[PDB]
């Protein structure tokens, strides 16, 4: 909670971050890092991509580290990290 809030703050302590969303499968974020409407939109995208990534991982191997998968893109280093109950995703810069 507050420890997780501080963990999110520390991962976002690096200034210049576009947005990191502690997320949830319900299309809404546990803790996003942007304006609320765009946060809900990107969090719905996060839930959709999270289900997609869970399915793709199970297609690859259904016995893997069921915690995260970063996507370091030249536009946003999307550090997606969904838990079993909660979720997270960090669309960050590639430098960090």
């Amino acid at each position: 909670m507050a420890e997780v809030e501080e963990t999110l703050k520390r991962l976002q302590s690096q200034k210049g971050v576009q947005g990191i969303i502690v997320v949830n499968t319900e299309g809404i974020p546990i803790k996003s890092t942007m304006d609320n409407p765009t946060t809900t939109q990107y969090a719905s995208l996060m839930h959709s991509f999270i289900l997609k990534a869970r399915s793709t991982v199970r297609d690859i191997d259904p016995q893997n580290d069921l915690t995260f998968l970063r996507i370091r893109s030249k536009k946003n280093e999307i550090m997606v990290a969904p838990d079993k109950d909660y979720f997270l995703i960090v669309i960050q810069n590639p430098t960090e």
Binding site: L8, N24, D85, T95
Partner: protein, 429 residues
């Protein structure tokens, strides 16, 4: 909403999020750039300055604010199972009196992050702080009162997991020294209180110590255990120093289990003393070194109640000193001025090989080098952390440097024989 807050507050889910952030930090530490030039074109100016002091190179600075303020580096221990891990025992947060008197911190060699991997927070000032020699995920230290606490590095609760007994029979005096000792099969959680309570405890039992003994010698004069060390493989043998500036061997077993020897040469309370930590082609168990609050460092020997040799170059009262773990010649020291005094006697005897007092006089109080000794963490009380890397030309001892170390020790024996003959003949009639 409220379900999201509960899931954040959910213990298993919060622990999973914490392990997730831990692996995230591991990956972000593994997150190297892509426009790199590993050919070394940027080290020539460093190589242009390497020939003038590459033996010292600070690595990182594990400095924080969550528990660093008003909290000195009370003790330091590099984890045996994970050498890439180091601890940071904190003093009583006077500036954060709202915060408790002890919150442990991890100075990390595995990664460069201000966030510690393990923390042990408790309401007492951590005097001693011993890492688990035979265990992978345990933490324990010495309270300002003296009751030893327990914690786990792998866990997710900084509170003192278990606490040792606190009583007149238990550690009433502050726990000056404590270490993970004994065999892997026959262990001993040896601890030392200020009054002299030699507290061999058990990792399983936080109520009854395995061997508790208040210490006193010299017609049972109370033992203020100042300097602490012990012999490798000799669990009975241990090194004792006094605030009254008295050194002694310590016996754990035997009819005289307690203060065994009696040595005194210093002019201050025994500040910094570590055993001869380097083992090579020569066995030098019969000697050691010591330092006090008298701006001097006194070498010691097993049979010599008089100190072996003097490193008195300090312009102020010393705090800490340690023989190197690999090079017999080398030995690092510290003081309230940050007197980094790595002195390789075979290399530089009259002057230290690396004598670096901190500008602005940083308060170097407690420290622990690398397991290989390649780096030594040094820190001010306010939290100015320095981990100086060691130039291997100075760091790595020679193969003959143990035989040559015995040669230099015999040379010191001859020079001290000249000095003692001068002392004997200098008495007039």
């Amino acid at each position: 909403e409220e379900e999201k807050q509960q899931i954040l507050h959910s213990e298993e889910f919060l622990s999973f999020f914490d392990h997730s952030t831990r692996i995230v930090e591991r990956a972000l530490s593994e997150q190297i750039n892509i426009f790199f030039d590993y050919s070394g074109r940027d080290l020539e100016d460093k190589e242009g300055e390497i020939q003038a002091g590459a033996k010292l190179s600070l690595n990182r600075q594990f400095f924080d604010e969550r528990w660093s303020k008003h909290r000195v580096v009370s003790c330091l221990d590099w984890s045996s199972q994970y050498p890439e891990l180091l601890v940071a025992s904190y003093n009583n947060n006077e500036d954060a009196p709202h915060e408790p008197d002890g919150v442990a911190l991890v100075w990390n060699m595995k990664y460069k992050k201000t966030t510690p991997e393990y923390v042990f927070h408790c309401q007492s000032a951590v005097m001693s702080a011993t890492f688990a020699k035979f265990h992978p995920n345990l933490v324990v230290g010495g309270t300002y009162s003296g009751q030893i606490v327990l914690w786990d590095n792998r866990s997710n609760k900084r509170t003192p997991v278990q606490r040792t007994p606190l009583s007149a029979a238990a550690h009433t005096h502050p726990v000056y020294c404590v270490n993970v000792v004994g065999t892997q099969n026959a262990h001993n959680l040896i601890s030392i209180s200020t009054d002299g309570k030699i507290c061999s405890w058990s990792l399983d039992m936080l109520s009854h110590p395995q061997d508790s003994m208040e210490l006193v010698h010299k017609q049972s004069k109370a033992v203020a255990v100042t300097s602490m060390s012990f012999p490798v493989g000799d669990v009975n043998n241990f090194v004792v120093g006094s605030e009254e500036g008295s050194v002694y061997t310590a016996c754990r077993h035997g009819s005289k289990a307690g203060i065994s020897e009696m040595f005194e040469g210093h002019q201050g309370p025994i500040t910094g003393i570590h055993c001869h930590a380097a083992v090579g082609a020569v066995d030098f168990s019969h000697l050691f070194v010591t330092s006090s609050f008298d701006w001097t460092v006194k070498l010691w020997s097993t049979k010599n109640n008089k100190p072996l040799y003097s490193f008195e170059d300090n312009a102020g009262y010393v705090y800490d000193v340690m023989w190197s773990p690999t090079h017999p010649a080398l030995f690092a020291c510290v003081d309230g001025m940050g007197r980094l005094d790595l002195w390789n006697l075979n290399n530089d005897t009259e002057v230290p090989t690396a004598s670096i007092s901190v500008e602005g006089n940083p308060a170097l109080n407690r420290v622990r080098w690398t397991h290989s000794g390649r780096e030594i963490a040094v820190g001010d009380s306010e939290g100015q952390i320095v981990i100086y890397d060691v130039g291997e030309q100075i760091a790595v001892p020679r193969n003959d440097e143990w035989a040559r170390f015995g040669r230099t020790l015999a040379e010191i024996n001859a020079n001290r024989a000249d000095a003692e003959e001068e002392a004997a003949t200098r008495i007039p009639a």
